[PDB]
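Lab notebook, page 48
Experiment: co-folding of the full assembly
Goal: obtain a model of how the components sit together before planning crosslinking
Operator: M.T.
Materials (sequences as entered):
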Amino acid sequence: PSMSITRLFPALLECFGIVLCGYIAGRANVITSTQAKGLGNFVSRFALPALLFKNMVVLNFSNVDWSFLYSILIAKASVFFIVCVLTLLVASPDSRFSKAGLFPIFATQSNDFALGYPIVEALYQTTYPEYLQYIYLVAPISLMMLNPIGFIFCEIQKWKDTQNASQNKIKIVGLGLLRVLQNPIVFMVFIGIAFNFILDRKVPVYVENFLDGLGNSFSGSALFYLGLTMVGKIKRLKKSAFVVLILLITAKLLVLPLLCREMVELLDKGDSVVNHTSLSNYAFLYGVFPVAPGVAIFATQFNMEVEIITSGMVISTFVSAPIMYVSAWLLTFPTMDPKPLAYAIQNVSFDISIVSLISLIWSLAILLLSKKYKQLPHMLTTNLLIAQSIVCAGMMIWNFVKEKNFVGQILVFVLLYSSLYSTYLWTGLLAISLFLLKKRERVQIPVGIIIISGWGIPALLVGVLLITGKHNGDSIDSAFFYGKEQMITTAVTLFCSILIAGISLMCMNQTAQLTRHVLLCLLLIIGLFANLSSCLWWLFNQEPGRLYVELQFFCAVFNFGQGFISFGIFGLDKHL
Amino acid sequence: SMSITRLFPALLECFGIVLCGYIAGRANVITSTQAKGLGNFVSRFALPALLFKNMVVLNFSNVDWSFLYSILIAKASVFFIVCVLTLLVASPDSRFSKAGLFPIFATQSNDFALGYPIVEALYQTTYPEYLQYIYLVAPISLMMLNPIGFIFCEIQKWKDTNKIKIVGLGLLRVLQNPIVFMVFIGIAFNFILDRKVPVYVENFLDGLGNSFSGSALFYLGLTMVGKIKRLKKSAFVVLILLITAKLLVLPLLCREMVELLDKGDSVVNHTSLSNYAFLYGVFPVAPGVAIFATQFNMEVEIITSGMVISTFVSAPIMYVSAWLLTFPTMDPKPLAYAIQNVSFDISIVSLISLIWSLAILLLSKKYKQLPHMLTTNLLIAQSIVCAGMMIWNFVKEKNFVGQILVFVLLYSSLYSTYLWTGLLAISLFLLKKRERVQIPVGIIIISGWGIPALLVGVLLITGKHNGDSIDSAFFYGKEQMITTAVTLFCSILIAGISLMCMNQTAQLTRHVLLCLLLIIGLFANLSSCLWWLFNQEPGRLYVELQFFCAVFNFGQGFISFGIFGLDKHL
Ligand SMILES: *[C@@H]1O[C@H](CO)[C@@H](O)[C@H](O)[C@H]1NC(C)=O
Ligand SMILES: *[C@@H]1O[C@H](CO)[C@@H](O)[C@H](O)[C@H]1NC(C)=O
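Observation: model returned without errors.
Model output:
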């Protein structure tokens, strides 16, 4: 298989549950900012050097495939190079140097030791154990060979601020180099490299247990400190700052991994195909890691665009968790055997539905306890989140009732597709209600009649698909329970909702609470747009290709992880 | 059967992280307000996650319950005796606060932070079922003994200002402890999921539970900065009694009651269980007791000082006690390797701490004072003894001359440290009564460098070296032990005269105790020399006494560093 992809989701659950625990402790009032500063002082001055010293003392230089290492470093250097060049061209002259010195560090440095190491440990203990050392090999060399260029740029900008006009470029570039060398990772890696040759690859027995005890405490405490640093750093941004954060985070999380994969297939001349494919998949997985908090530390000590870099980190850190999941499950998809892709789709939808259901339970509890349900339009939003909770509960039933009885399977399918179709048309009803409220017309909206329609029409569609459709016993996936009749019924329900939302969207342009309501209608249309395309692909192409598999996987993710997006938009808000 | 070889790396982890936390605390790296956040993480997030994971996984079917209520009766018995005399002997205005805080302090060990790594090192590859007993005894001991103490402290709170009102307050504070209610949920979830955590939850509990085993000791080291304070005579005396109770008579009660209540029927397992039961009581006082005294705001100084003292004092007690249990085993010939290994491992920690204390005294320019000058002379000699053991472990099968050279330096250093403690005490007694400069101390230092050299010279001049000796008692045969006895008797008489001159005449606050703590050491050193001459066939009692002679000879620098080094700087 060359990838133990079943046990990736527990690693992302650990790595983001400890981050969530740190965030909860930060926002509550359990640990204030100063005490989180003390925990970070402990982590950054004791835990990371012991971990690095142990993993470089035990590091084996005989089995290291250097080709992957300098291919990944060439990729990171290329990403840094393009981002610095366009940062010099497109930024304003008054602050081109500050952006050119801090943005490529943000878009080139990864959170390897805190987040990357447990995930790679979960994915690469069982079959390919030699890939664990590449984190500790690549991250400090990348730091040492790419960070000084950024600190050089930030120090020219600091020279700009001093406006001395005396040159002596040595005084500045050596200042940047010594600021780089004061990082604990670089000189601690130097000490570990020296002691690897001094001790002859063997940790002393008197110090081994002490270093293991101090190093094993880095992961959880580091994720907890990341969660404690992350309270309240997002704030409200300004025009064009949204676009430059999108461009930087797309660069870091998208074009660096593709460059890593392309340079790995370009620079590796190995004679083994399975080793080459696993190296390419690991190269894709390495670049999707989020930005380390060291960039925000550097901007804080510099007092230099601290808000932009911190906002960039909290968005890339939140955003990479599904990007990691989707990318790794897309990478493990090809070859295999035709039949276990259905089990893979069911397992991925189950792991997504767990997190969406938990976040949806939290957001529903917040919306109910805040007593904001009585005012329009948030009542229909509460109904929508309730319907998505029934979809997720339908997956909880469907994972365990796949092969029990035909009658129970039919009832579970009817309930699950009723909830799915109700969510589908509730998006259109919310959009129509938003369009009616945007008109500022004194029209009494029949919310009770709308709820009766929304609870009856999907049930009628499920009953019609049961009565007229033919059940397919050889289909283990939920999408082919009734065959082509069910997909035709899902297309008609989705097309009517898209037409209703399309009329409301066209009314919004002519007419131009409501600040967020529109985007939840907007973001669902992209979800409904991806559902339509996989149904259109099946009639015109008789042969199910790999693109059909990729489109069905994205249909599953954008259909059943919508509660996560809804929680991210509404639930993480103050006052309520 | 005990893996006693791998105890000393565990004692380096458990006290090196505490030392790392203390240095960062005293320096100014983490101040007091910031240390609270690290404690908040450990006490609210790492410890509850740790407790929940290891009890859902452990099997209740194979737990030897006989050991469980035997260990608990011993802790209950210690609590009972300490509570009884605290009501009789204390002042009437504070009988209830002392009777409620002193016996809780003498019963809760540091099992989750300090006890768990030591038991893990000793009991993984040979007896792996003994590791689950840490997580069983410490919370059960908490629920059935802490409320009994807590009733008395709430009466004292009542005194300044209905039995439900008092006993329910003590009872409801215990279930608010994270240890107590997390153990309740883990026992329930052991039966719900049938000894299996879900795969989606396995990694989350492991990541949060492995971060306790390092961070809690760091916070324990960080909490003790500046907490020792100063105490009066009556508080020093009750503190000695309390630390003696927790670290001495509680472990001996555990061993005796476990051998009485398990009723054998285990062959090799009962003997191994008895040694482990004695080891459980040696663990120091948990830092939760100092936390407990803070929320009560009663007897805060004594309990905090007792906790910061018990963690330090228990560090050699763990090593000596565990190595004494493995002695009645193997054969007499690899017993010599066991004696050599313990002395080498003690001398490592003593030498590193001695280098620090010597550096502090030299750099701070307090050595220019005449009373502190003799301590510096004493402390340099203690550093060279420890370095001599590093040579002797590696020079045993080499040429006779190299063996002789290692032996001459080590025993020269041993007699000089022995007599240098007494001349300084005599010089301090002479300086306290006479204003004359210590001009004979220079002649004494020449003597102290010459008299050991003369003893060293007699062994070089007279050919009586016995090669069949392994460690040290037969280096020159009976001639070396006779020479060591004459040197030891002259040093004890000089120190005895200085102690007697202090009573007849009636900085100096700590100087005396460093002289005092050595006096308990030279009398135990003298008895082992007397034991060898008055006995032809070496018995088993001679083996235990010879080991104790080795520890106070080669780790004597550790006691000196703890008294003098951690005072101040300039
Ligand atoms: C990768 O290494 C070599 C390729 O030269 C070959 O044995 C095989 O393709 C792989 N081996 C292992 C052990 O993964
Ligand atoms: C411990 O268990 C039983 C106790 O009766 C016995 O086999 C022996 O003493 C020990 N056995 C093992 C395998 O440790």
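Interpretation: The longest helix of chain B spans residues 400-433.
Next step: discuss with group before ordering constructs.
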